[PDB]
Every structure is written in structure tokens, then in C-alpha cells.
Amino acid sequence: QTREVLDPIVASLMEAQQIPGMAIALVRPEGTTISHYGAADRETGTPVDDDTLFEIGSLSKTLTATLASLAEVEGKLDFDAPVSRYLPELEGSAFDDISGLNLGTHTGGGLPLFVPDEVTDRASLMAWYREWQPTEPIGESRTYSNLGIGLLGLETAASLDGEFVPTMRAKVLAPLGMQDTWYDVPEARMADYAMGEDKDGQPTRVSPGVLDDEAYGIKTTAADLAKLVRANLHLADVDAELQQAIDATRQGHYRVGDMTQALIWEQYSLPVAPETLRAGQGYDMILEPNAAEALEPPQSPRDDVWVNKTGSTQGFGGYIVMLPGKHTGLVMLANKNYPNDARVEAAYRILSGLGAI
């Protein structure tokens, strides 16, 4: 059925890219199909199953954004207000002029991609934030940043008067039914934890780091993410505030060439060519500052769009795609960091083969 469309494309993808294992969820109106492929660990040959946990890396940022947006709904966080307002430890710094909205759309004044080596903890981090000088016009330039989204998650935590991961647990994960979603994988589940594989074919597993939780830290299943995507597509039974919070994450906030930057979710109007999609996942978009223009009639979630998000670690490769107007979504997790082109193409082929595009 679905499986007849899906299975040969994933088989071809897994061969062409030498991916040990994948887990795939297709959300549609009529229900969700979970499919598992290959080995969770290439060495042992243990198959991927219902309980296999994958690093999603940068995909974690959508959870961070969801929780942020939920603090905003509850009236505890204002997205427009300066960050120093909820983190007063940063008064007098650049963050008097940078907002939570800026942080969730990567328009926080050129905040770099990585946490610098010198920053080894929260104190050295806040100190680094205090000193840092912007290198690009705030709100007019997009630079993909772990420092920024992470700061959004500190700010959100602060404003809800709690710590990040337990607050995320109670307010987003648990209500969505995402009990296989872990920031720190418990001892009992380690046998379910997929082993990753880099582009030279080496075993690799993410290491702890500052802001790992807020930026790239989740390990989870395809089904759990299907629950988030399900909510986004309004096919879930969810609390009304959480549902607004989730919907608010899909508001277009800035234009960046062909791409509309929402709250971490990136989107494109239909019809869209795969090349455009590839451009959005490429060096030019990810590793360079790109002019951004704030959307002034600020856009309600659209229903004629490709909404997507990539996630990688050194040994894992994930991608989510949502077509809100067809109530259709795709979660593909892999335990190999395989190129973003292969992701967009496999996605497109899948969704086109199903007739969603």
C-alpha cells in the first residue's frame, strides 16, 4: 500500500548511502504508518524496532521552540521583549536589544553556530554572552546558531521558573505522549540506543556539551516525533494551549530568499522544486549569514506549504516534512549522517509517490 510506495525508495536510499538502519513514520488522515529498517548497530546487527532510540541532533530545536512558544501562550514569555528581561544576568549586553523571537528564527545579531571551546559551563557561557558583540544587523540577518536556540531555552526555563528538561518533560513531551524521548538516556534503555556512523563509516555517539539539551540533545523514536508532527497537522487530541503553542511555531516570521523562517521550522510555498529545498539545507544557507526580512503582516500558519527541518549529529541523520494542506507528514530517522540532498530527494519521492505533491 503505502508500504509498496515507501519500501523500495528506502531500500534504494539505504543502499546508495550505506545506512545501517532507519525508522520512518508517515502521518496521514486515516492514520500513522511506522516502518523500521536495517540494523540499529552495524556491528551487532540488532535490528531497528519500536524501541530503537535515535539521536536527532538539530531536530531537538523544534521541541525547544515549542516549549518557548508555550511560555508565550501562558503569558509568561513575550517573544518581542529583550532577552535580558528574563535573564537579568545579561543586562547591559547585546541581549538588551535581542528578543526571544530573534533567537527562535536565528536572527539574533549574528550569533555563531557553535559554542566556543572557552565556554565550559553556564557561568563561562553567561560571561561569554555578556561580552559578545553582534556582527550582523539584528532582525535583518539569519545565521543558524546553537548559541541562540540554546539561549532561547535558558530564557524559556527562567520565565517558567524551572529547569529545562523536566519542564520540557511535563509541558510538551508527556502531554503529547512522547515517553520514548530522552535527553539523557537511562541505563535500562542503553540496549535500545542505536549506534551512529559518520561519513567515513566509523562508530560514533554524541558527546555531552553546554546547551546540548536545548540545541541537539534529544534521542527519540520515529513514532514519538510522529506525535509532534501529528499535533502540528491537527490530527492529535491535545490541550488547547499546547495546540496554539504548536500552531504558533509555524507562523512565518521572516523571508530569507525562497525560504520562510517560522519558529525554527523552515518552510516553502507550493509548488516548490527539490533544488530549492536542497539550497535551504546547503552551505550557503546554513554556514553563511543570509538577509532576512521581517514579515510585517506576520503570517498565520499557511496550508499551502512544504514545512521541514533537518537534524544531524556526527553519526545520525534525520528529516521531518509536513504538508499541512494535505494533513500529511514524514519522519525519517537514520543512524548515519547522510547528505541533506539524499534526504530531500527521498522525502520528495516518497510524498510524490503517495500523491501528496
* Least spacing, CB of residue 64 vs Sr ion, in Å: 13
* 97 marked as binding residue: no
Window 142-161: residues binding Cl ion (CB under 5 A): 146
Cβ proximity to Cl ion, 115 vs 226, nearer residue: 115
| Dist CA 275 CA 198 (whole Å) | 25
- What distance in Å separates the CA atoms of residue 258 and residue 263, rounded to the nearest whole number? 16
Q: Which is nearer to Sr ion, 197 or 213 (CB)?
A: 213
Smallest CA-to-CA distance from 137 within 115, 101, 111 is with 111
For position 136 contacting Sr ion by CB under 5 A, the verdict is: no
Strand partners, 332: 24, 319
- DSSP-assigned letter for residue 57: G
Q: After which residues is the chain broken (C to N over 2.5 A)?
A: none
Q: Which of 144, 183, 216, 348 is catalytic?
A: 144
Q: Phi then psi for 264, rounded to 5 degrees?
A: 65, -50
- Name residues whose C-beta falls within 8 Å of residue 146's C-beta, 6 or more positions apart in sequence: 113, 114, 115, 211, 215, 216
**What is the identity of the amino acid at 338?**
Y
Partner whose footprint covers residue 213, from Cl ion, Sr ion, none (CB < 5 to 8 Å by kind): Sr ion
Annotation marks residue 58 as catalytic: yes
Select the binding partner of residue 114 from Sr ion, Cl ion, none (C-beta < 5 to 8 A, by kind).
Cl ion
> What part of residues 59-118 is at the interface with Sr ion (CB under 5 A)?
none
Please tell me which residue in 58, 69, 141, 145 is annotated as part of the active site: 58
Q: Would you say 237 is a known binding-site residue? A: no
Contact pick of 136, 180, 197, 213 for Sr ion (by CB under 5 A): 213
Within 97-126, the residues that bind Cl ion by CB under 5 A are 114-115
Choose among Sr ion, Cl ion, none what residue 102 binds, the Cβ cut-off being 5 to 8 Å by kind: none
Cβ atoms of 150 and 143 within 8 Å: the answer is no
Dihedral sign from CA coordinates of 28, 32, 38, 40: positive
Annotated binding-site residues for Ca(2+) read 51, 78, 80, 117, 192, 212-213, 284, 288, 345
Catalytic residues: 58, 144
> Which residues contribute to the site for Cl ion (CB under 5 A)?
114-115, 146
> Which residues contribute to the site for Sr ion (CB under 5 A)?
213
